[PDB]
Symmetry: D2
Subunit: 460 residues, 4 copies
């Protein structure tokens, strides 16, 4: 086996040891492996996969293969690969093209190495994506391959936003499952994953005390809620910015002061609109929005000296790092940790005090500066991915007549019953014991003893 | 000249008025609606039957409805939840209200009937505001001619919405309803944070027990169970959680709670042998939050640690098998809404007996029965939605639609997300919060208007 | 016929007894002493002048002292802290007690005098139990002859100890004293966790304000300040802390609080220009915890955000300049111990004015004034220490010693650490907690006895 | 041509220097001392033997000592705690340092001897800075003539102070010592909040285990156990606490933890039958914090839930019986300082065995072994005390005193509270905190100087 490219194949034994541990941390995913192994529901599936090549993704990949699939894999971020995970996957005879610290050019080449096998397009028939970069490449550059592809399973909020836009414009060519919006994904991974991994990443990058310092978290969706808790539970004084008044209300009730970087919340593009007194007190800013330029150049100029700047949203353009590359000198402290010296572009005093610390060059910091979400959280997300792969592969969209295809071309979530069955394996993994409704109680609230227990409108 | 009311003590009106004036300053969303709509009188002609806890917070709601043009006739929806100074201030303002703390069940029914009837005949009501659905069911079973001229029902709480949806499914719901509970500024504000504030409040007022270091079991982890669990954990309780819904149980685990069942392997086989006696024998406090029936049952009550406190914060008291305790055990009133229940027998007890449980509010929802319910600034969200829902259904004029047009609007719906957001904005400004305004480029990048709504209807917050 | 008492309403006795029976089950350290020493009667012959908040918890203390053989004559140490059902139950037990909630200052002084005098003549007291030093100073200044027959003072609280140490330093202390405050099972239990339980309790009872998301300023971060800040932070307040002690301020920072001063650069030059008006204009709640004077002064009160709540949980009301507010602003009573202070001037208020502050308990310690003080399970520690300190000083019989012997024993001392640990053990067993027993090898390895004491006297916990 | 050092890799120096420059901005009390005393050179002529974790933070300490005039010879006090880039940067600045991460025990001892000897003979040392007492012991046992010229020891940690006080009580301590550990800005900053920061940090780096919703048992609840319990509880762990000291156990209860013992009724009867197997079979993580011996013993390790993590954050690895595991069970290295310990036998294992434990840092203190120890801004307090303590003892010149003068000064003492407050003030200012200044009237009222000290020496904070 040579159909791979990783940083260091000799890291495979280490990766395998950590994969074995992760298996014990992922009962929902391992439960799927044991339940479906005999049936081989993914036999004949050929899955193009593009998502962070971590230990957790390793268990996902080996589950898909255990259920019958062939895959070709790449990471979806230049800094998120764990080289020991990539090595163990390569060592198991699975094509993987990923390493921590890719250039942008190498990132694209890796995705292309999955799309092409031995110089020609692979006969792929399934896609697993995180954020939609592979989805867009297939649509823009390889539309003929989409004729043979039965579906896409998309991991994350930004990827879903891009899928819905294509569907709205009539450009989506195969159906998709929104894996993000399973409750055992969005309200587990997006929130509690970041609760675990944001302070983890900041500590590994800087080793800064967080207790007693001032943080500003931009956004209070699922990622912003978990990120704010990551910081507050360490004793940070956290302020929260939001454009959505409902999410701002939740931030208030959770005990956070809600503030804007701009006077009266109005960004008129001028420096005069920056709340300089507020930003001058902030030791740490974290962007969580999935939006663009929410930590802009004027905010970066006004931040307190030596503030830490990081992003845990999907794409690095939440922060105007381009402005910083154009105007300020970058000092590498260590990989994925840069001091950005606001004193000039072409040099800096080694003992300068007017700098910012940028983590992961603005790429998602939990994966770039630590290891991302822990296995027992990714268990929920990735159990959903496997169910979504099984569901779309069994439907065989690519083999339907044109009229049948029109009826199935959608972006759907998994049924609530499967959401509950994933959650139950997660609960048992903690040693939790769910109560069984009596027949009288089940009649009283109008559900089956087996579930589902909530209407589809329920928000948890 | 006004006598069309019944309250505990009208002399409490001045105190109630003082507390209403304070609550106005804590309810910016509700008082914003009062300012915004007073000139146009959107509820002119509305005659609202209202049945919800006669608190200070409900008083501000009532006076907002009246300020916008409505007439009302009011009762409380629970026998223990009225604040007598609130009822007195409302009656003193010339508003028909029939409510006092400590009603009997017969007086509860009479009070609702006093709103329905005026001078012994059906009132010309045309709107209904309800909490839990008791008023709604009485109208459907006993006063169907009155429903002909009623334009809608606005329903406050999870249990009432369940009852409305069941009537709609069976085709017996006679007028459209707005599910006020499922505004995010209700369900994810009131149901959760209100119980966070008021559960430990009620337990302290009823018992003055230290909670730190003691063991609690919360039955349920929906919105009320989540807020209830935090109310106790933030005081230092060691909180375990029970759930039938594995997704909610997953949230409890991630939130740092041990998830347990009262029954071995979660299976209630009906016998004492299925009870986890070791677990229940360690619990100092059990709180029911489910909206379900008999989730703190006789066999659990028998197994609880001596001197444990038992209470319910769900809508109805049958969450706990209090009937079993009335039939079998000796009740000793400590003070109003606090009883020691002696497990040594039915007829009499030794005053120094150590084998008792403490029941709060006779199993009725404890935050309203033993304290004052949710605080004004939280009820601001729920009741701003109520006012918006009353305006919405009243303007639609369902009773005046022809039969074929009624058929297209007979539903149970929530308010538009834009209104939910506008309520939350006023709440946020009440805290001094400053929301950020999207730039045009950012609004285009995420595909929303700068004015909102900011999330798709599928968003769960 | 027993008549040697004055309480608000003797008919509350039965309610008080019911709550005393409950509190006994919540105070295992105190009731452990009652059971261990009953046969020995170590306080036979003791005649105790007691002056401390006449609560249910103090009731259990009083009845413990009596059960161990003492006679007592009791008053409350604060005009607002008595629980009338507790005072009635004690009076109904034939115990002289002079206390009711809502005393005037003259009535407060008169009550202390009714304990000192029996049938118009000085009682033959030989022991003192005090909270804050008022009774101690009256005896020293007004009844010095009574001190010749007194064997010692046991003092509950930080402020009272400060006053005792000053008298010892100046040679005016006439009898030995035990500093009960500085047992760890007092200072690091009662002062901290008691306020944690009872500060947000009192604020909710007085105002029913939502605390979540609002801004608080706690003045001081000693034991009371630490517990008060946690009481508010755990409810979701955004808490800032002020301190003059940099070590305490360091703890506040590490605990996750912003440390700020009401004054620019922390310097109070007496002028309004030194007030940080922007800071105070955002504060919704200020709580004074210092035992110091005028830490919430007139210029701070002028600068506070409209409708801020103002309260004190330190020992005396002069932490807040309420004299300035009485002289310059108009007071509107909302209900007992809750006043709106209208900053619009003297000489009349508009009932709908928005420019007021809310003052709780007229500046007196708010946990006892607007709620019920610390819960029984916390006061268990403080009051087991009191019982042990009374036994200790009474057995020493200072008043009977020759002058050279008295000279050597005239001091202000804390109880031995071994007793402190023995109180804590009973508290821990009350929670079901299980301490581990050191093996002899482990005890040898750290240089302690298996029995304890486990820490050197320098240890700070 | 500087060669008087031994480190892992000198080419890591530039990276170490970058992190030192950052750490200087995180250590304002230490850099304040540098600026205050540089001109005075108070440590001119000082020659310090240093033995403490060769971290970035120790690097800032070393460079402060040198900047005040000292020469040093340095080693790490633990085989796994050195940060190799820190050591390289110190060596690159021309400072003798003998330290690398992953020393053998033999190399550990050789490194200490390289500080003691220079070119084969005793260095002309005259000061000692130590953590845990290994260097102090070696000097007393093997180099008594060197102690003749040494003016003092400054000891960092609880375990080292315990060893100093035993030598003092036995007459074998040869030079005076400063207990740096018991400054409040050390013990109640470093010991507590340092572990709060770095314990969950080390566990995440070693295992990347989710902690939320899992079960932990923290052995001990002193300063380290308090900070460790919070480290885990704040992550959502369900934390149980063990203690032999009932006062610390009481604090754990009040802080909201269940207090349990690994042994039934807390009593070890010398057999497996006294292990609470039901309790330990539920524990996912056990952390020892005691400074005691064998508090996680062989029978406890046999009973732990499969796949539980085992670690120690006390000073020495013998808190856990790792010797039993080396003798009986098969060790599989996951990665450096992370081992799976297969309870299925000593001779080999199945790679997919489920019956293993995970041991971090081979039982050596886990925050330093699997992460980077405490953060700079916390070590600021500890190491500012170290500098002040070195200055104080060096200026006293004990070695030069006549025998009868030595006798009056041979002691183990803490720094004065005034210095403790001055360190804290610089820490507070580092956070942007603003302490209030007492007015003259307020200072008189509480009996302190406006400058401080603000508390009596008995105060426990
Ligand atoms: N790093 C991780 O492991 C991880 C985990 C989950 C999701 N994600 C990514 O994180 C991002 C956020 O995901 P989510 O699920 O929380 O989305 P979300 O829609 O739930 O929340 C994003 C929030 O940002 C707010 N926002 C938008 N523009 C803003 C602005 N200018 N100022 C302030 N707030 C603003 C929105 O109002 C919204 O509430 C997405 O890109 C998603 O793909 C990352
Ligand atoms: N007292 C208050 O102020 C207040 C506030 C809001 C709602 N309510 C009432 O509280 C109740 C709960 O409301 P909600 O909005 O949280 O509803 P919800 O549907 O969100 O949550 C109820 C939860 O109970 C769980 N449950 C049901 N049967 C169970 C059983 N046998 N054991 C364990 N868990 C079980 C369900 O899985 C569900 O998650 C309703 O009756 C509602 O009307 C009261
Ligand atoms: N209400 C209760 O139940 C209760 C309980 C215990 C004690 N007390 C009383 O509370 C008070 C405080 O007791 P404690 O044990 O916490 O005392 P403490 O000495 O531990 O703490 C008081 C703190 O106030 C700080 N302080 C003093 N002046 C200040 C100022 N101008 N600005 C800011 N901070 C200032 C001091 O630095 C000190 O840290 C005393 O009067 C005590 O008798 C009341
Ligand atoms: N790793 C770090 O960074 C770090 C930081 C500070 C101190 N330390 C070390 O940590 C250890 C603890 O220090 P500390 O300051 O917390 O000491 P401490 O005296 O404050 O606390 C130790 C506690 O352990 C308890 N204990 C003793 N034997 C026990 C047993 N068998 N079971 C349960 N509890 C038991 C004692 O009662 C005591 O409360 C010392 O070895 C110290 O040198 C390490
Ligand atoms: N980063 C660090 N650098 C140096 N010493 C440390 C660090 N973290 C913890 N310590 C110290 O290690 C000692 C235990 O050996 C504790 O007393 C503590 O002060
Ligand atoms: Cl032994
Ligand atoms: K991970
Ligand atoms: K209320
Ligand atoms: K009480
Ligand atoms: K560090």
């Amino acid at each position: 086996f040579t159909d791979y490219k990783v940083a260091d194949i000799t890291l495979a034994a280490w990766g395998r040891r950590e994969l074995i541990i992760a298996e014990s941390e992922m009962p929902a995913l391992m439960g799927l492996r044991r339940k479906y192994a005999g049936q081989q529901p993914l036999k004949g599936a050929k899955i193009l996969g593009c998502i962070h090549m971590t230990i957790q993704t390793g268990v996902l990949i080996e589950t898909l293969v255990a259920l019958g699939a062939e895959v070709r894999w790449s990471s979806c971020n230049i800094f998120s690969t764990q080289d020991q995970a990539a090595a163990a996957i390569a060592a198991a005879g699975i094509p993987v093209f990923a390493w921590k610290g890719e250039t942008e050019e190498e990132y694209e080449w890796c995705i292309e190495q999955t799309i092409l096998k031995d110089g020609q397009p692979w006969d792929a028939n399934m896609v697993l994506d995180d954020g939609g970069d592979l989805t867009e490449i297939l649509h823009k550059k390889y539309p003929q391959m989409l004729e043979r592809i039965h579906g896409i399973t998309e991991e994350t909020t930004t990827g879903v936003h891009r899928l819905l836009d294509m569907l709205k414009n009539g450009t989506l060519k195969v159906p998709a499952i929104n894996v993000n919006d399973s409750v055992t994904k969005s309200k587990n991974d997006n929130k509690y994953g970041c609760r675990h991994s944001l302070n983890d990443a900041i500590k590994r990058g800087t080793d800064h005390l967080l207790s007693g310092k001032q943080a500003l978290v931009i956004g209070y969706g699922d990622v912003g809620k978990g990120s704010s808790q990551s910081l507050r539970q360490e004793g940070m004084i956290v302020k929260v910015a939001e454009v959505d008044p409902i999410c701002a209300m939740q931030a208030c009730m959770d005990g956070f002061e809600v503030v804007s970087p701009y006077k009266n919340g109005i960004n008129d593009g001028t420096e005069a609109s920056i709340d300089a007194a507020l930003l001058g007190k902030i030791d740490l800013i974290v962007t969580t929005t999935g939006n663009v330029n929410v930590c802009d150049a004027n905010m970066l100029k006004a931040l307190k000296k030596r503030a830490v700047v990081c992003n845990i949203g999907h794409f690095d353009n939440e922060i105007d790092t381009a402005f910083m590359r154009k105007n300020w000198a970058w000092e590498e402290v260590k990989p994925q940790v840069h001091k950005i010296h606001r004193t000039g572009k072409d040099g800096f005093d080694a003992h300068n005090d007017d700098y910012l610390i940028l983590l992961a060059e603005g790429r998602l910091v939990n994966l770039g500066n630590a290891t991302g979400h822990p296995s027992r959280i990714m268990d929920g997300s990735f159990a959903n991915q496997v169910l979504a792969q099984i569901h779309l592969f069994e439907q065989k969209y690519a083999d339907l007549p044109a009229a049948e295809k029109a009826k199935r071309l959608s972006v759907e979530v998994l049924p609530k019953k499967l959401d509950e069955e994933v959650a139950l394996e997660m609960v048992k993994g903690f040693g939790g014991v769910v109560t069984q409704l009596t027949p009288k109680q089940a009649e009283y609230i109008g559900v089956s003893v087996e579930g589902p227990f909530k209407p589809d409108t329920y928000r948890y």
